[PDB]
């Protein structure tokens, strides 16, 4: 067996292709940041369907968090999470991102500071003639009994930004 054989298989995938999927997500919190109005909605132009978070990040502190969540029935079986964040590549965008996730019940914080990035060096991707900074997040965690929902924490670190941020391609994997 090749040493690069994937030891995992895709158990759950959310690509936000339909706006109905957004109704399954909710905002589960803020700290030193705010949501706008509405807090979340669907966007059909980014990632051919993405979760749009309308955020207000003052960029004054090193942890400015907005958080969203969704139930996942099979989550206790899983050990790897991947997801993408896209931020409009607007003039002057500067700062650090500290994205992570939470398994719940149990409020189990996973991948803390495991996927940090300077926004100014992040990959650029284009959708519909517009540029985005891309942040791919990959988090490893233990099979955890009783967990039923996943929270995605989008955390700014002196990243002043008022506008939409996007989440896409939420994928959960279990070991074979
Ligand atoms: Ca998508």
PDB file of C-alpha atoms and ligand atoms in Angstrom:
ATOM      1  CA  UNK A   1       0.000   0.000   0.000  1.00  0.00           C
ATOM      2  CA  UNK A   2       1.418   3.400  -1.098  1.00  0.00           C
ATOM      3  CA  UNK A   3       2.675   5.543   1.771  1.00  0.00           C
ATOM      4  CA  UNK A   4       0.445   8.412   0.544  1.00  0.00           C
ATOM      5  CA  UNK A   5      -2.748   6.328   0.601  1.00  0.00           C
ATOM      6  CA  UNK A   6      -5.495   8.403   2.223  1.00  0.00           C
ATOM      7  CA  UNK A   7      -6.214   6.756   5.594  1.00  0.00           C
ATOM      8  CA  UNK A   8      -9.601   8.556   5.748  1.00  0.00           C
ATOM      9  CA  UNK A   9     -12.851   8.829   3.822  1.00  0.00           C
ATOM     10  CA  UNK A  10     -15.320  11.657   3.383  1.00  0.00           C
ATOM     11  CA  UNK A  11     -18.239  11.186   5.776  1.00  0.00           C
ATOM     12  CA  UNK A  12     -20.037  14.591   5.423  1.00  0.00           C
ATOM     13  CA  UNK A  13     -19.808  17.479   2.918  1.00  0.00           C
ATOM     14  CA  UNK A  14     -21.487  20.832   2.852  1.00  0.00           C
ATOM     15  CA  UNK A  15     -20.846  22.819  -0.318  1.00  0.00           C
ATOM     16  CA  UNK A  16     -23.751  25.279   0.057  1.00  0.00           C
ATOM     17  CA  UNK A  17     -24.963  24.689  -3.523  1.00  0.00           C
ATOM     18  CA  UNK A  18     -28.576  25.445  -2.462  1.00  0.00           C
ATOM     19  CA  UNK A  19     -29.637  28.463  -0.348  1.00  0.00           C
ATOM     20  CA  UNK A  20     -31.867  26.086   1.662  1.00  0.00           C
ATOM     21  CA  UNK A  21     -28.725  24.635   3.264  1.00  0.00           C
ATOM     22  CA  UNK A  22     -28.102  27.974   5.042  1.00  0.00           C
ATOM     23  CA  UNK A  23     -31.308  27.453   7.071  1.00  0.00           C
ATOM     24  CA  UNK A  24     -29.455  24.590   8.810  1.00  0.00           C
ATOM     25  CA  UNK A  25     -26.712  26.954  10.078  1.00  0.00           C
ATOM     26  CA  UNK A  26     -26.947  29.440  12.941  1.00  0.00           C
ATOM     27  CA  UNK A  27     -24.823  32.078  14.605  1.00  0.00           C
ATOM     28  CA  UNK A  28     -23.574  30.699  17.916  1.00  0.00           C
ATOM     29  CA  UNK A  29     -21.629  33.668  19.161  1.00  0.00           C
ATOM     30  CA  UNK A  30     -19.406  36.727  19.103  1.00  0.00           C
ATOM     31  CA  UNK A  31     -16.503  38.034  21.200  1.00  0.00           C
ATOM     32  CA  UNK A  32     -14.965  41.483  20.584  1.00  0.00           C
ATOM     33  CA  UNK A  33     -16.769  41.519  17.192  1.00  0.00           C
ATOM     34  CA  UNK A  34     -20.302  41.691  15.849  1.00  0.00           C
ATOM     35  CA  UNK A  35     -22.528  40.332  13.138  1.00  0.00           C
ATOM     36  CA  UNK A  36     -24.397  42.681  10.836  1.00  0.00           C
ATOM     37  CA  UNK A  37     -27.904  42.165   9.484  1.00  0.00           C
ATOM     38  CA  UNK A  38     -28.773  39.587   8.506  1.00  0.00           C
ATOM     39  CA  UNK A  39     -26.131  37.660  10.443  1.00  0.00           C
ATOM     40  CA  UNK A  40     -25.827  34.918   7.828  1.00  0.00           C
ATOM     41  CA  UNK A  41     -27.287  34.351   4.359  1.00  0.00           C
ATOM     42  CA  UNK A  42     -26.543  32.494   1.140  1.00  0.00           C
ATOM     43  CA  UNK A  43     -24.367  33.886  -1.651  1.00  0.00           C
ATOM     44  CA  UNK A  44     -24.564  32.254  -5.085  1.00  0.00           C
ATOM     45  CA  UNK A  45     -21.591  34.028  -6.670  1.00  0.00           C
ATOM     46  CA  UNK A  46     -18.855  32.960  -4.232  1.00  0.00           C
ATOM     47  CA  UNK A  47     -17.708  29.313  -4.524  1.00  0.00           C
ATOM     48  CA  UNK A  48     -20.862  28.619  -6.592  1.00  0.00           C
ATOM     49  CA  UNK A  49     -22.816  28.895  -3.324  1.00  0.00           C
ATOM     50  CA  UNK A  50     -21.252  29.774   0.013  1.00  0.00           C
ATOM     51  CA  UNK A  51     -22.299  30.729   3.501  1.00  0.00           C
ATOM     52  CA  UNK A  52     -22.109  34.489   3.878  1.00  0.00           C
ATOM     53  CA  UNK A  53     -21.337  35.927   7.313  1.00  0.00           C
ATOM     54  CA  UNK A  54     -21.861  39.696   7.618  1.00  0.00           C
ATOM     55  CA  UNK A  55     -19.253  40.746  10.150  1.00  0.00           C
ATOM     56  CA  UNK A  56     -17.891  43.866  11.825  1.00  0.00           C
ATOM     57  CA  UNK A  57     -14.373  43.266  13.119  1.00  0.00           C
ATOM     58  CA  UNK A  58     -12.888  46.423  14.737  1.00  0.00           C
ATOM     59  CA  UNK A  59      -9.308  45.135  14.318  1.00  0.00           C
ATOM     60  CA  UNK A  60      -8.357  46.437  17.797  1.00  0.00           C
ATOM     61  CA  UNK A  61      -7.578  43.197  19.541  1.00  0.00           C
ATOM     62  CA  UNK A  62      -5.892  39.842  18.887  1.00  0.00           C
ATOM     63  CA  UNK A  63      -9.095  37.741  19.137  1.00  0.00           C
ATOM     64  CA  UNK A  64     -12.192  39.100  17.422  1.00  0.00           C
ATOM     65  CA  UNK A  65     -14.565  36.186  16.857  1.00  0.00           C
ATOM     66  CA  UNK A  66     -17.800  35.443  15.085  1.00  0.00           C
ATOM     67  CA  UNK A  67     -19.039  31.881  15.067  1.00  0.00           C
ATOM     68  CA  UNK A  68     -21.528  29.733  13.161  1.00  0.00           C
ATOM     69  CA  UNK A  69     -22.679  26.142  13.596  1.00  0.00           C
ATOM     70  CA  UNK A  70     -24.594  23.224  12.157  1.00  0.00           C
ATOM     71  CA  UNK A  71     -25.743  19.806  13.382  1.00  0.00           C
ATOM     72  CA  UNK A  72     -23.874  16.791  11.978  1.00  0.00           C
ATOM     73  CA  UNK A  73     -25.357  13.420  12.939  1.00  0.00           C
ATOM     74  CA  UNK A  74     -22.203  11.412  12.312  1.00  0.00           C
ATOM     75  CA  UNK A  75     -19.801  13.934  13.961  1.00  0.00           C
ATOM     76  CA  UNK A  76     -18.813  11.603  16.853  1.00  0.00           C
ATOM     77  CA  UNK A  77     -17.395   9.197  14.202  1.00  0.00           C
ATOM     78  CA  UNK A  78     -15.124  11.845  12.625  1.00  0.00           C
ATOM     79  CA  UNK A  79     -11.459  12.814  13.092  1.00  0.00           C
ATOM     80  CA  UNK A  80     -10.627  15.378  10.348  1.00  0.00           C
ATOM     81  CA  UNK A  81     -12.331  18.628   9.479  1.00  0.00           C
ATOM     82  CA  UNK A  82     -11.588  20.801   6.418  1.00  0.00           C
ATOM     83  CA  UNK A  83     -13.259  24.021   5.405  1.00  0.00           C
ATOM     84  CA  UNK A  84     -12.456  27.161   3.367  1.00  0.00           C
ATOM     85  CA  UNK A  85     -12.840  30.805   4.331  1.00  0.00           C
ATOM     86  CA  UNK A  86     -12.892  33.530   1.652  1.00  0.00           C
ATOM     87  CA  UNK A  87     -12.449  37.236   2.442  1.00  0.00           C
ATOM     88  CA  UNK A  88     -12.976  39.884  -0.308  1.00  0.00           C
ATOM     89  CA  UNK A  89      -9.504  41.134  -1.252  1.00  0.00           C
ATOM     90  CA  UNK A  90     -10.381  44.812  -0.544  1.00  0.00           C
ATOM     91  CA  UNK A  91      -7.847  47.656  -0.540  1.00  0.00           C
ATOM     92  CA  UNK A  92      -6.000  47.901   2.731  1.00  0.00           C
ATOM     93  CA  UNK A  93      -6.971  44.431   4.066  1.00  0.00           C
ATOM     94  CA  UNK A  94      -4.347  43.686   6.682  1.00  0.00           C
ATOM     95  CA  UNK A  95      -3.999  41.465   9.758  1.00  0.00           C
ATOM     96  CA  UNK A  96      -4.057  37.837  10.913  1.00  0.00           C
ATOM     97  CA  UNK A  97      -6.758  35.137  10.961  1.00  0.00           C
ATOM     98  CA  UNK A  98      -6.958  32.473  13.679  1.00  0.00           C
ATOM     99  CA  UNK A  99      -9.771  30.187  12.463  1.00  0.00           C
ATOM    100  CA  UNK A 100     -10.682  27.131  14.558  1.00  0.00           C
ATOM    101  CA  UNK A 101     -13.700  24.915  15.359  1.00  0.00           C
ATOM    102  CA  UNK A 102     -15.683  23.552  18.322  1.00  0.00           C
ATOM    103  CA  UNK A 103     -17.348  20.164  18.858  1.00  0.00           C
ATOM    104  CA  UNK A 104     -20.557  20.349  20.940  1.00  0.00           C
ATOM    105  CA  UNK A 105     -22.081  19.308  23.376  1.00  0.00           C
ATOM    106  CA  UNK A 106     -18.910  19.542  25.515  1.00  0.00           C
ATOM    107  CA  UNK A 107     -17.639  22.815  23.955  1.00  0.00           C
ATOM    108  CA  UNK A 108     -14.499  21.065  22.733  1.00  0.00           C
ATOM    109  CA  UNK A 109     -12.249  23.580  21.017  1.00  0.00           C
ATOM    110  CA  UNK A 110     -10.254  21.957  18.204  1.00  0.00           C
ATOM    111  CA  UNK A 111      -7.366  23.263  16.018  1.00  0.00           C
ATOM    112  CA  UNK A 112      -6.741  26.329  18.179  1.00  0.00           C
ATOM    113  CA  UNK A 113      -3.983  28.364  16.475  1.00  0.00           C
ATOM    114  CA  UNK A 114      -3.274  25.422  14.133  1.00  0.00           C
ATOM    115  CA  UNK A 115      -4.261  27.305  10.936  1.00  0.00           C
ATOM    116  CA  UNK A 116      -3.161  30.903  11.529  1.00  0.00           C
ATOM    117  CA  UNK A 117      -2.424  33.100   8.486  1.00  0.00           C
ATOM    118  CA  UNK A 118      -1.415  36.645   7.566  1.00  0.00           C
ATOM    119  CA  UNK A 119      -4.209  37.914   5.337  1.00  0.00           C
ATOM    120  CA  UNK A 120      -1.733  39.750   3.052  1.00  0.00           C
ATOM    121  CA  UNK A 121       0.085  36.551   2.120  1.00  0.00           C
ATOM    122  CA  UNK A 122      -3.022  34.389   1.654  1.00  0.00           C
ATOM    123  CA  UNK A 123      -3.753  32.741  -1.662  1.00  0.00           C
ATOM    124  CA  UNK A 124      -5.825  34.831  -4.054  1.00  0.00           C
ATOM    125  CA  UNK A 125      -8.781  33.176  -5.786  1.00  0.00           C
ATOM    126  CA  UNK A 126     -11.283  34.745  -8.155  1.00  0.00           C
ATOM    127  CA  UNK A 127     -15.104  34.349  -8.330  1.00  0.00           C
ATOM    128  CA  UNK A 128     -17.258  36.244 -10.834  1.00  0.00           C
ATOM    129  CA  UNK A 129     -14.558  38.803 -11.632  1.00  0.00           C
ATOM    130  CA  UNK A 130     -13.752  39.521  -7.964  1.00  0.00           C
ATOM    131  CA  UNK A 131     -10.698  38.629  -5.854  1.00  0.00           C
ATOM    132  CA  UNK A 132     -10.796  36.829  -2.476  1.00  0.00           C
ATOM    133  CA  UNK A 133      -8.164  35.831   0.013  1.00  0.00           C
ATOM    134  CA  UNK A 134      -8.518  32.060   0.609  1.00  0.00           C
ATOM    135  CA  UNK A 135      -7.854  30.350   3.943  1.00  0.00           C
ATOM    136  CA  UNK A 136      -8.001  26.551   3.843  1.00  0.00           C
ATOM    137  CA  UNK A 137      -8.358  25.084   7.324  1.00  0.00           C
ATOM    138  CA  UNK A 138      -7.578  21.489   8.237  1.00  0.00           C
ATOM    139  CA  UNK A 139      -8.085  20.251  11.785  1.00  0.00           C
ATOM    140  CA  UNK A 140      -7.349  16.836  13.297  1.00  0.00           C
ATOM    141  CA  UNK A 141      -9.240  15.695  16.368  1.00  0.00           C
ATOM    142  CA  UNK A 142     -10.251  12.595  18.381  1.00  0.00           C
ATOM    143  CA  UNK A 143     -13.442  10.634  17.965  1.00  0.00           C
ATOM    144  CA  UNK A 144     -15.558  12.286  20.659  1.00  0.00           C
ATOM    145  CA  UNK A 145     -18.624  10.698  22.243  1.00  0.00           C
ATOM    146  CA  UNK A 146     -21.827  12.693  22.348  1.00  0.00           C
ATOM    147  CA  UNK A 147     -20.906  15.492  19.925  1.00  0.00           C
ATOM    148  CA  UNK A 148     -23.768  16.507  17.646  1.00  0.00           C
ATOM    149  CA  UNK A 149     -22.778  19.859  16.166  1.00  0.00           C
ATOM    150  CA  UNK A 150     -19.810  21.636  14.698  1.00  0.00           C
ATOM    151  CA  UNK A 151     -19.046  25.307  15.306  1.00  0.00           C
ATOM    152  CA  UNK A 152     -16.692  27.202  13.002  1.00  0.00           C
ATOM    153  CA  UNK A 153     -14.917  30.077  14.635  1.00  0.00           C
ATOM    154  CA  UNK A 154     -13.698  32.877  12.373  1.00  0.00           C
ATOM    155  CA  UNK A 155     -11.232  34.908  14.434  1.00  0.00           C
ATOM    156  CA  UNK A 156      -9.578  38.172  13.407  1.00  0.00           C
ATOM    157  CA  UNK A 157      -6.301  39.312  14.954  1.00  0.00           C
ATOM    158  CA  UNK A 158      -5.978  43.075  14.379  1.00  0.00           C
ATOM    159  CA  UNK A 159      -7.851  42.561  11.130  1.00  0.00           C
ATOM    160  CA  UNK A 160     -10.130  45.545  10.675  1.00  0.00           C
ATOM    161  CA  UNK A 161     -12.931  44.488   8.372  1.00  0.00           C
ATOM    162  CA  UNK A 162     -16.589  45.385   7.893  1.00  0.00           C
ATOM    163  CA  UNK A 163     -18.288  43.283   5.208  1.00  0.00           C
ATOM    164  CA  UNK A 164     -19.051  39.677   4.136  1.00  0.00           C
ATOM    165  CA  UNK A 165     -16.834  36.741   4.848  1.00  0.00           C
ATOM    166  CA  UNK A 166     -17.515  33.371   3.248  1.00  0.00           C
ATOM    167  CA  UNK A 167     -17.360  29.785   4.429  1.00  0.00           C
ATOM    168  CA  UNK A 168     -17.380  26.907   1.943  1.00  0.00           C
ATOM    169  CA  UNK A 169     -16.509  23.238   1.415  1.00  0.00           C
ATOM    170  CA  UNK A 170     -17.048  22.033   4.973  1.00  0.00           C
ATOM    171  CA  UNK A 171     -15.861  18.380   4.893  1.00  0.00           C
ATOM    172  CA  UNK A 172     -15.726  15.807   7.650  1.00  0.00           C
ATOM    173  CA  UNK A 173     -13.726  12.568   7.396  1.00  0.00           C
ATOM    174  CA  UNK A 174     -13.506   9.315   9.336  1.00  0.00           C
ATOM    175  CA  UNK A 175     -10.501   6.941   9.493  1.00  0.00           C
ATOM    176  CA  UNK A 176     -10.902   3.704   7.469  1.00  0.00           C
TER     177      UNK A 176
HETATM  178 CA1  LIG B   1     -19.802  26.101  -2.609  1.00  0.00          CA
END
